Amino acid sequence: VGWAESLIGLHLGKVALITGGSAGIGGQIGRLLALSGARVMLAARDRHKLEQMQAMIQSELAEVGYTDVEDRVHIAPGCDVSSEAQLADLVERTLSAFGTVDYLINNAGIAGVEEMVIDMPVEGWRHTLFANLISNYSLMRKLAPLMKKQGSGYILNVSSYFGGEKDAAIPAPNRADYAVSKAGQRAMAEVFARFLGPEIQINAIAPGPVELFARRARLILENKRLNELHAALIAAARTDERSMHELVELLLPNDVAALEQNPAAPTALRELARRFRSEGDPAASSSSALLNRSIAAKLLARLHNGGYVLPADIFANLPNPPDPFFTRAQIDREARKVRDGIMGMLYLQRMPTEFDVAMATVYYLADRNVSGETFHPSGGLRYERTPTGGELFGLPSPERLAELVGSTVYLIGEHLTEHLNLLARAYLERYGARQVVMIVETETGAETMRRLLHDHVEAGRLMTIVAGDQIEAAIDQAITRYGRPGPVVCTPFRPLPTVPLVGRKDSDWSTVLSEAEFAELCEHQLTHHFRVARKIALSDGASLALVTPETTATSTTEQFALANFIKTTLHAFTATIGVESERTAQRILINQVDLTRRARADPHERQQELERFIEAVLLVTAPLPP
Ligand SMILES: [Mg+2]
Ligand SMILES: [Mg+2]
């Protein structure tokens, strides 16, 4: 009798580790697993919140008739999952308390940087990947050996609808780091299942929206002001002789009315001011002041990152608009717009509670016959998605191909020398590009490409730059010395690793892909492209192709799995920055080109494989006529 009845015995005899276990979905999964008879370890940062969650669950267990409830619910406070050292301590603490872990519930997540890519610090991106994605691999790598040795285990990654679907990506503007980490959580389950079977199940859950929008609305309105100011300054500079520095000085009085009426100001800035007044709330200082110090700092960074020369202290004396910069009426209005938009996307016109999602998840965990899947414990969304892995294709139109004549091409890479050689020669010999800038990682890479392209090096058509781990500064060098690019083709510097992804039942797994190697994989195959895109998305007229890693007939099955992991995970990034790029005055296109095809299965077939690559890249880097 009672709603927990459905649960008694459901997970009896299991030991579960739940990260982010002090609140939200994770706390409810921990609660319901304990009611179902599992011993649970709840991991989180704040001791107090985790203590009160422990006390609530233990009280509920005793209420249902469990005895010795202290033995059934343990906590691991101070656990920052972005710290590899603290993940090691968590596993030690959990094994000492309970012995082998049966269920790894990878639930901890941080929201991330919550900015557009062009405003997203590289270290904040990396931190989100460590907290939300690399942490899931790390705990799997520590717990799967014991699971396989005992003959059973279960890894559940708590992804999100923001991570997309198996064969379709979803844009998540202002959340690219988060969306990438969510897509990676799903892709990890999709590609590791064949290696972790038969002993270990690995699945993801991807709930849709779950039960304030005010902070989110806040961010949207501040973002809007930043984007509108940036876009107006870029537009004004196209038809005004003054330097960007001189144009930004027009903003320093921080006075909407004075700017609208300044006959020395470019019309784009006067029209912007007229817009802020006409569309604003009279009680909001954003209707009478152009910006605040927070928005001003982000604007200055965009301009610097786009190559504009301005003093670091240009906004040091900017007058500070009085609170509220946006009124609660403005914030609540945008919040209701966000809410109503999500409610409108749900087929069922209701969102689940955290309890509902956890209950469905805890029933799902009892199913012993599924692996490699993403379960949707809530779902039914009208969001548009972008199918991934469409194959058949050809050359672009002759009108678009002719537009490459005289263009400046950037190629980035090092490992894929045959791809880089053929692409450079296609642009230069076949389509009359003026010059190719070859941006490599090392001097040895540079010498290799200079050797392969010696004729074009001698003729001044092929320039090489050595980027090292300073790709942003290398792009700046290319822009200053050789001019802005049209095509930019971004291939990974590094090949995929050649290591096993699982160990033998009785082995120590010492040769299996390490936690540190997994982080390096993300650095070289995801963050590499993020860093290039972050810069190129400020370069007007660029067409960026992000290229994911190769697999050949000599590539291992582990490399094929890692290539598919990267493909899926990067498609979340590509879809997101595509939408974000619509908000800047700079005209940029961003597309992804996948080298590894769907199935694993002589010098002629190779050269046609490479020729389809060339055609793919041309189809997304040739500019459409204006
Ligand atoms: Mg100008
Ligand atoms: Mg654009």
Side-chain angles (χ1 to χ4, degrees), residues 581-582 584 586-588:
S581 192
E582 305 175 7
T584 63
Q586 291 84 356
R587 281 79 57 97
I588 297 95

Side-chain angles (χ1 to χ4, degrees), residues 130 254 262 288 381 555 595 600 621:
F130 273 94
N254 202 8
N262 182 358
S288 62
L381 314 174
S555 292
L595 288 180
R600 181 176 175 84
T621 60

